[PDB]
Write an enzyme that holds these catalytic residues in place. Structure first.
Site, short mmCIF file in Angstrom:
data_model
loop_
_atom_site.label_atom_id
_atom_site.label_comp_id
_atom_site.label_asym_id
_atom_site.label_seq_id
_atom_site.Cartn_x
_atom_site.Cartn_y
_atom_site.Cartn_z
N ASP A 101 -21.20 6.20 -29.93
CA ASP A 101 -22.76 6.35 -29.08
C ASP A 101 -23.46 5.93 -30.98
N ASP B 87 2.06 3.44 3.01
CA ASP B 87 1.28 3.42 3.36
C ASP B 87 0.55 4.43 4.64
N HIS C 230 1.61 8.13 5.16
CA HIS C 230 0.03 9.37 5.68
C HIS C 230 1.37 10.16 6.98
N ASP D 155 0.42 -1.03 0.01
CA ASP D 155 0.02 1.03 -0.26
C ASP D 155 0.76 1.12 0.39
N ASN E 35 -19.87 7.08 -21.53
CA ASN E 35 -19.35 5.62 -20.86
C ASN E 35 -18.09 5.47 -21.35
N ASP F 67 -19.67 10.66 -27.30
CA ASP F 67 -20.28 10.05 -26.20
C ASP F 67 -21.22 10.64 -25.36
N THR G 218 -6.62 3.70 -2.16
CA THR G 218 -6.34 1.65 -2.19
C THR G 218 -7.92 1.16 -2.40
N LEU H 93 -17.94 4.62 -24.69
CA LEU H 93 -17.80 3.81 -25.72
C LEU H 93 -18.68 4.00 -26.87
C1 LIG Z 1 -13.77 -1.87 -19.79
O1 LIG Z 1 -14.78 -2.96 -19.52
C2 LIG Z 1 -16.00 -3.31 -19.48
C3 LIG Z 1 -16.41 -5.10 -19.12
O2 LIG Z 1 -15.45 -5.22 -20.56
C4 LIG Z 1 -17.21 -2.70 -20.26
O3 LIG Z 1 -18.40 -2.89 -19.64
C5 LIG Z 1 -19.26 -3.67 -20.40
O4 LIG Z 1 -19.98 -3.51 -20.82
C6 LIG Z 1 -20.75 -4.20 -22.04
C7 LIG Z 1 -21.81 -3.14 -22.98
O5 LIG Z 1 -21.57 -1.83 -22.49
C8 LIG Z 1 -22.11 -3.89 -20.74
O6 LIG Z 1 -23.02 -5.18 -20.94
C9 LIG Z 1 -24.82 -4.77 -21.80
O7 LIG Z 1 -24.23 -6.05 -20.13
C10 LIG Z 1 -26.35 -5.40 -19.28
C11 LIG Z 1 -26.34 -7.07 -18.54
O8 LIG Z 1 -25.41 -6.53 -17.63
C12 LIG Z 1 -25.30 -7.45 -16.71
O9 LIG Z 1 -24.66 -8.82 -16.12
C13 LIG Z 1 -22.98 -8.13 -16.40
C14 LIG Z 1 -22.81 -9.76 -16.54
O10 LIG Z 1 -23.14 -11.03 -15.83
C15 LIG Z 1 -22.69 -7.54 -15.65
O11 LIG Z 1 -21.02 -7.20 -16.27
C16 LIG Z 1 -23.35 -6.03 -15.09
O12 LIG Z 1 -22.43 -5.53 -13.96
C17 LIG Z 1 -23.10 -4.07 -13.75
O13 LIG Z 1 -23.96 -4.02 -13.13
C18 LIG Z 1 -23.58 -4.37 -11.95
C19 LIG Z 1 -25.40 -4.13 -11.28
O14 LIG Z 1 -25.05 -3.13 -10.95
C20 LIG Z 1 -22.89 -3.91 -11.44
O15 LIG Z 1 -22.29 -4.08 -10.15
C21 LIG Z 1 -21.50 -4.24 -12.60
O16 LIG Z 1 -20.04 -3.11 -11.28
C22 LIG Z 1 -21.71 -3.86 -13.59
O17 LIG Z 1 -21.80 -2.13 -13.84
C23 LIG Z 1 -21.25 -1.31 -14.84
O18 LIG Z 1 -22.00 -1.73 -15.80
C24 LIG Z 1 -23.13 -0.64 -15.80
C25 LIG Z 1 -23.56 -1.14 -17.16
O19 LIG Z 1 -24.00 -2.46 -17.12
C26 LIG Z 1 -23.50 0.51 -16.08
O20 LIG Z 1 -24.77 0.86 -15.63
C27 LIG Z 1 -22.52 0.66 -14.51
O21 LIG Z 1 -22.56 2.12 -15.01
C28 LIG Z 1 -21.20 0.41 -14.22
O22 LIG Z 1 -20.14 0.94 -14.79
C29 LIG Z 1 -24.83 -6.64 -14.98
O23 LIG Z 1 -25.11 -7.05 -14.53
C30 LIG Z 1 -26.64 -6.25 -20.88
O24 LIG Z 1 -28.26 -6.10 -20.37
C31 LIG Z 1 -26.46 -5.13 -22.09
O25 LIG Z 1 -26.83 -5.41 -23.73
C32 LIG Z 1 -27.40 -4.80 -24.57
O26 LIG Z 1 -27.76 -5.76 -25.29
C33 LIG Z 1 -29.03 -6.04 -25.50
C34 LIG Z 1 -28.94 -6.85 -27.02
O27 LIG Z 1 -27.63 -8.25 -27.06
C35 LIG Z 1 -29.89 -4.64 -25.39
O28 LIG Z 1 -31.12 -5.36 -25.98
C36 LIG Z 1 -29.52 -3.93 -24.62
O29 LIG Z 1 -29.71 -2.69 -24.91
C37 LIG Z 1 -27.93 -3.58 -24.17
O30 LIG Z 1 -27.48 -2.44 -25.71
C38 LIG Z 1 -25.35 -5.21 -22.44
O31 LIG Z 1 -24.29 -6.45 -22.84
C39 LIG Z 1 -21.35 -4.86 -19.40
O32 LIG Z 1 -22.20 -5.44 -18.26
C40 LIG Z 1 -20.46 -4.00 -18.79
N1 LIG Z 1 -20.32 -4.87 -18.02
C41 LIG Z 1 -18.86 -4.51 -16.61
C42 LIG Z 1 -18.16 -5.18 -16.05
O33 LIG Z 1 -19.17 -2.93 -16.34
C43 LIG Z 1 -17.11 -1.33 -20.51
O34 LIG Z 1 -17.50 -0.84 -21.40
C44 LIG Z 1 -15.55 -1.34 -20.62
N2 LIG Z 1 -14.74 0.41 -20.82
C45 LIG Z 1 -14.69 1.20 -21.68
C46 LIG Z 1 -14.28 2.07 -21.77
O35 LIG Z 1 -14.35 -0.04 -22.79
O1 LIG Z 2 -8.78 0.05 4.91
C1 LIG Z 2 -7.27 0.69 4.65
N1 LIG Z 2 -6.92 -0.90 4.70
C2 LIG Z 2 -6.91 -2.63 5.08
C3 LIG Z 2 -6.88 -3.31 3.88
C4 LIG Z 2 -7.94 -4.96 4.27
C5 LIG Z 2 -6.90 -5.77 4.00
N2 LIG Z 2 -6.70 -5.80 2.23
C6 LIG Z 2 -6.16 -6.49 1.51
O2 LIG Z 2 -6.10 -7.65 2.32
O3 LIG Z 2 -5.77 -6.04 0.14
C7 LIG Z 2 -5.17 -7.24 -0.41
C8 LIG Z 2 -5.69 -7.07 -1.44
C9 LIG Z 2 -5.46 -7.46 -3.09
C10 LIG Z 2 -5.68 -7.85 -3.92
C11 LIG Z 2 -4.69 -7.65 -5.12
F1 LIG Z 2 -5.15 -7.41 -6.29
F2 LIG Z 2 -3.89 -6.65 -5.39
F3 LIG Z 2 -4.02 -9.08 -5.16
C12 LIG Z 2 -6.75 -7.24 -4.62
C13 LIG Z 2 -7.87 -6.76 -3.90
C14 LIG Z 2 -8.94 -6.53 -3.95
F4 LIG Z 2 -9.27 -5.10 -3.37
F5 LIG Z 2 -8.95 -6.72 -5.17
F6 LIG Z 2 -9.50 -7.39 -2.87
C15 LIG Z 2 -6.80 -7.02 -2.15
C16 LIG Z 2 -7.18 -4.14 1.96
C17 LIG Z 2 -7.90 -3.62 3.17
C18 LIG Z 2 -6.37 1.15 4.09
C19 LIG Z 2 -5.41 1.31 3.96
C20 LIG Z 2 -4.69 3.03 3.38
C21 LIG Z 2 -5.42 4.08 3.11
N3 LIG Z 2 -5.04 5.27 2.50
N4 LIG Z 2 -6.21 6.29 2.62
N5 LIG Z 2 -7.03 5.27 3.28
C22 LIG Z 2 -6.65 3.72 3.75
C23 LIG Z 2 -7.70 2.85 4.36
CA LIG Z 3 -21.09 6.20 -25.24
ZN LIG Z 4 -3.99 2.21 -0.17
ZN LIG Z 5 -3.49 5.90 2.16
#
Ligand SMILES: *[C@@H]1O[C@H](CO)[C@@H](O[C@@H]2O[C@H](CO)[C@@H](O[C@@H]3O[C@H](CO[C@H]4O[C@H](CO)[C@@H](O)[C@H](O[C@H]5O[C@H](CO)[C@@H](O)[C@H](O)[C@@H]5O[C@H]5O[C@H](CO)[C@@H](O)[C@H](O)[C@@H]5O)[C@@H]4O)[C@@H](O)[C@H](O[C@H]4O[C@H](CO)[C@@H](O)[C@H](O)[C@@H]4O)[C@@H]3O)[C@H](O)[C@H]2NC(C)=O)[C@H](O)[C@H]1NC(C)=O
Ligand SMILES: O=C(NC[C@@H]1[C@H]2CN(C(=O)OCc3cc(C(F)(F)F)cc(C(F)(F)F)c3)C[C@@H]12)c1ccc2[nH]nnc2c1
Ligand SMILES: [Ca+2]
Ligand SMILES: [Zn+2]
Ligand SMILES: [Zn+2]
Ligand SMILES: *[C@@H]1O[C@H](CO)[C@@H](O[C@@H]2O[C@H](CO)[C@@H](O)[C@H](O)[C@H]2NC(C)=O)[C@H](O)[C@H]1NC(C)=O
Ligand SMILES: *[C@@H]1O[C@H](CO)[C@@H](O[C@@H]2O[C@H](CO)[C@@H](O)[C@H](O)[C@H]2NC(C)=O)[C@H](O)[C@H]1NC(C)=O
Ligand SMILES: [Ca+2]
Ligand SMILES: [Cl-]
Ligand SMILES: [K+]
Ligand code: NA
Length: 778
Positions: free
Chosen positions: A666, A261, A265, A121, A662, A658, A159, A664
């Protein structure tokens, strides 16, 4: 309810995931208040410390001891890491000369090299400059393995957004961990670092490495370590897991350190007090490597030494207060510090005035140490907008400063969270082991790229992510990914002279040299035309009524000419494109707010005859007069300056749509703005990709080897409020604005649906590295 009456006997740090009412003996049992009553007693032994001493050699096994020095410790896998050194006359791993690991040298039962992720960290990239004097184990890993001078974190340089990006290959806007603290308006709940709410699965999106591993039948060790578990116990646990039977042993492990870290700080990055935590992390690395050497795994395992972010000099004396700019701050909630996120105190409070707040925060102090942005206006390289947890109002804070709500809100000398291109925010990357290259330095790269590499190191298929698979093949000896060139979807039209000048009623009055890396491929279904001219080539969209790209080459000593007086308002119809698929000048005469610009600049015409081509209706794009100040300066001054400095440049420029921010391209339905009384869509941004020869002695149009690239994604805004010095001449502020909006070619590809550099003399993996490159100006 969990039955704590159970026992941890023969279950300490079991990988067996057991649910309620059964009590747990794993690392996360404390956080879920589910540990068996004897967990601390049996699993957290501390007696006699963590090192073997000469008096302990060949001792009788005492189960109360933290680690062992008895003869049976090796067969039991629970020796203190220095057992063979103190008791068997072996040398510490750090004291051995490094030898190339050409192939994994694994004991019986290991069919694949295990992966150990050693995360640190707040490990600023520059701390590596301390070297073997402070960190001999880390220096050996760095020197003998593969290392980058630094690794770029994601924004905010906090973090949890960075650790989760490392685990998923996703931008925070996509994985959902947008800050160490965040408010989700749909859940109506706050995520905090010191709360039980963070354990709720609903916050965590994407697919982290341990899940990718588990879904594909690969066992993973813990990625979360309890604060109460000391570093020496974390190391001993990893080593104990590595000693497990073939059918129980994980393939991927993670170690984490809260240092450097914590001390960063307190004392700031350049404090003398920073030596002690750096020595301590090095001692922990030494314990791990000695431990691995003891298990005959030191030439078998792939070790990744990686940081989440850097550390900057930040003190209480350098804090801006919103109460100094705004009358009432009591109706606002501010996520403060090294970034600012503003929202109403009451979730859906209607008294909240965002436009008046931004106005009061815009260039209101001469040396203002932050800049406000509506999230859609943040630099596109930050990829920080497409999430409901990201407040519309954002404050990008100046390095070394803090932003706070009021004076009521030094014990701290360091902080992090600033713009991810800031030098002090850069962190570390070292890869050591059979799969990494030997004694190799690689260019800086982004942390979003590591998930694909870790999946390659484990024989896993990565879930969809933001990395560009193959861009980091140059880090690897083996397990490289063979990338596939995206298939061209739409074929271009090549129109000849098809219309008369009399056929147009638009209200308008008047490849060898320019396409050096092949035609960009259009990766979506559309209708477009290739247009050739003496000075430029374009891919004209018939749907958007403008080029998707304009490509041209400017020699080192090319002349800059002016637009003649009588050609100021000159727009000429293009006899190759139908009037129906053309823009019209009546729209630009009607729209009192919108003007127009040109993609190929008339200023860089090769001759007065050639200049007339630059005035074609097919080279025109909609531009606000405020934006024209920026675009004209880039077109007339900067393109030629870059040609002179780089020995010619090849320029590809074009629009970006855009509206839903997003990152991507439009679709037609997502375009929300058009030129007054027309169907001409308004770009949200304008891009430019400027390529030349890495070897500047060779001209851009006759380059034999690697390429050099700088790109930008300029926000197409109706004002220059972002540039506090915009009342001055363009020479005093435009280049500063462009540097802030620097971009990767890959960012442009996502935003346009185009694929660049398809015809070069370079390998596809090298081209992927080029496409992910970011010119930071840092
Ligand atoms: C970075 O890389 C990522 C990963 O490849 C890209 O993100 C993906 O973008 C695509 C296209 O926009 C998304 O596809 C659409 O998916 C929905 C269904 O999505 C659900 O299932 C998937 C798979 O299990 C999950 O990954 C999704 O997760 C999102 O939502 C949950 C719950 O809220 C959240 O916990 C996650 O963090 C994640 O959120 C993020 O994405 C959403 C958008 O999905 C966004 O609103 C949010 O702010 C976050 O950024 C989710 O549970 C599906 O319905 C869509 O359908 C489309 O196609 C049909 C036809 O086939 C059409 O009819 C319809 O109208 C749609 O156009 C899409 O398939 C994908 O979800 C998303 N994945 C993730 C992990 O974000 C980024 O675009 C990349 N970035 C760049 C700049 O390149
Ligand atoms: O709360 C703070 N620390 C608490 C830490 C616990 C345990 N931990 C842990 O074991 O992390 C290992 C790891 C490695 C990976 C990797 F991908 F790299 F391998 C991916 C993940 C993850 F997130 F994806 F799960 C986790 C994280 C939190 C903090 C620190 C400094 C700050 N500065 N300012 N605020 C602060 C707050
Ligand atoms: Ca767009
Ligand atoms: Zn950190
Ligand atoms: Zn810190
Ligand atoms: C909670 O855990 C304890 C220990 O595992 C359980 O106690 C056992 O109960 C059975 C009868 O149900 C006895 O035969 C065993 O001898 C008990 N174990 C010990 C170590 O004395 C207990 O039943 C569990 N269940 C609940 C609801 O508390
Ligand atoms: C923006 O800043 C201005 C000051 O430049 C604030 O205006 C003042 O508001 C106080 C209320 O306490 C009045 O007494 C003054 O007369 C106002 N001055 C002027 C020149 O109008 C304004 O309130 C701030 N706006 C926001 C949204 O905070
Ligand atoms: Ca003031
Ligand atoms: Cl935050
Ligand atoms: K106009
Ligand atoms: Na301004």
């Amino acid at each position: 309810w969990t039955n704590t009456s159970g026992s941890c006997k023969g279950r300490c740090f079991e990988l067996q995931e057991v649910g309620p009412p059964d009590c747990r003996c794993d690392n996360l049992c404390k956080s879920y208040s589910s540990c068996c009553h004897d967990f601390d007693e049996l699993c957290l032994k501390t007696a006699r410390g963590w090192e073997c001493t000469k008096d302990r050699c060949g001792e009788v096994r005492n189960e109360e001891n933290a680690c062992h020095c008895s003869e049976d410790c090796l067969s039991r896998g629970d020796c203190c890491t220095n057992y063979q050194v103190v008791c068997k006359g072996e040398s510490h791993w750090v004291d051995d000369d490094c030898e190339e690991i050409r192939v994994p040298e694994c004991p019986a039962g290991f069919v694949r090299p295990p992966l150990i992720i050693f995360s640190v960290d707040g490990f600023r990239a520059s701390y590596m400059k301390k070297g073997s004097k402070v960190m001999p184990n880390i220096e050996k890993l760095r020197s003998c393995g593969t290392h980058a001078p630094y690794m770029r974190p994601v924004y905010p340089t906090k973090t949890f957004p960075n650790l989760y990006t490392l685990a998923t290959g996703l931008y925070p806007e996509s994985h959902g961990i947008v800050g160490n603290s965040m408010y989700d308006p749909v859940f109506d709940a706050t995520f905090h670092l010191r709360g039980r709410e963070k354990f709720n699965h609903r916050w965590w999106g994407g697919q982290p490495l341990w899940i990718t591993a588990t879904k594909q039948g690969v066992r993973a060790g813990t990625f979360f370590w309890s604060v109460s578990i000391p570093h020496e116990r974390r190391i001993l646990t990893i080593l104990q897991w590595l000693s497990l039977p073939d059918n129980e042993r994980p393939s991927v492990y993670a170690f984490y350190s809260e240092q450097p870290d914590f001390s960063g700080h307190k004392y700031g990055p350049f404090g003398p007090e920073m030596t002690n935590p750096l020595r301590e992390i090095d001692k922990t690395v030494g314990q791990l490597m000695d431990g691995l050497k003891q298990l005959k795994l030191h030439r078998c395992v792939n070790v990744i030494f990686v940081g989440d972010h850097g550390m900057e000099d930040v003190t209480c004396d350098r804090t801006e207060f919103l109460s100094n700019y705004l009358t009432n701050v009591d109706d606002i909630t501010l996520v403060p510090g090294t970034l600012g996120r503003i929202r109403p105190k009451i979730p859906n409070n209607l008294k909240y005035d965002p436009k008046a707040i931004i106005a009061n925060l815009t260039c209101k102090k001469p040396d203002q140490h932050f800049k406000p942005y509506m999230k859609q206006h943040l630099p596109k390289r930050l990829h920080y907008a497409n999430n409901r947890r990201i407040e519309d109002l954002h404050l990008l804070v100046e390095r070394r400063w803090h932003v706070a709500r009021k004076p009521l809100d030094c014990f701290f000398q360091g902080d992090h969270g600033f713009d991810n291109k800031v030098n002090s925010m850069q962190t570390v990357f070292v890869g050591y082991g059979p799969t990494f290259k030997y004694r190799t330095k690689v260019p800086p790269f982004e942390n979003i790229e590591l998930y694909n590499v870790m999946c390659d190191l484990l024989g896993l298929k990565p879930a969809p992510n933001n990395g560009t698979h193959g861009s980091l093949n140059h880090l690897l000896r083996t397990n490289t990914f063979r990338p596939t060139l995206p298939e061209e979807v739409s074929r271009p039209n090549y129109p000849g002279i098809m219309y008369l000048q009399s056929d147009f009623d638009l209200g308008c009055t008047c490849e060898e040299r320019h396409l050096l890396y092949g035609r960009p491929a259009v990766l979506y279904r559309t209708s477009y035309d290739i247009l050739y001219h003496t000075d430029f080539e374009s891919g004209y969209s018939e749907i958007f009524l403008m080029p998707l790209w304009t490509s041209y080459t400017i020699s080192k000593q090319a002349e800059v000419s002016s637009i003649p007086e009588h050609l100021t308002n000159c727009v000429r119809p293009d006899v190759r494109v139908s009037p129906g698929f053309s823009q019209n000048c009546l729209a630009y005469k009607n729209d009192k707010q919108m003007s127009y610009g040109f993609l190929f600049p008339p200023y860089l015409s090769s001759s007065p005859e050639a200049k007339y081509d630059a005035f074609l209706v097919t080279n025109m794009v909609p531009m606000y007069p405020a934006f024209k100040r920026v675009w004209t300066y880039f077109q007339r001054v900067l393109v030629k300056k870059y040609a002179s400095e780089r020995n010619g440049v090849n320029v590809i420029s074009g629009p970006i749509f855009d509206y839903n921010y997003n990152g991507l391209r439009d679709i037609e339905d997502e375009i929300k703005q058009y030129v007054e009384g027309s169907s001409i869509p308004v770009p949200t941004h304008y891009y430019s990709i400027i390529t030349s020869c890495l070897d500047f002695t060779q001209p851009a149009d006759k380059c034999d080897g690697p390429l050099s690239v700088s790109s930008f994604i300029l926000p197409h805004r109706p004002d220059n409020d972002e540039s506090c010095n915009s009342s001055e001449d363009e020479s005093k502020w435009v280049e500063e604005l462009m540097k802030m909006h620097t971009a990767r070619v890959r960012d442009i590809e996502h935003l346009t649906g185009l694929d660049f550099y398809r015809k070069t003399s370079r390998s596809y993996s090298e081209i992927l590295t080029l496409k992910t490159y970011l010119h930071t100006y840092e």
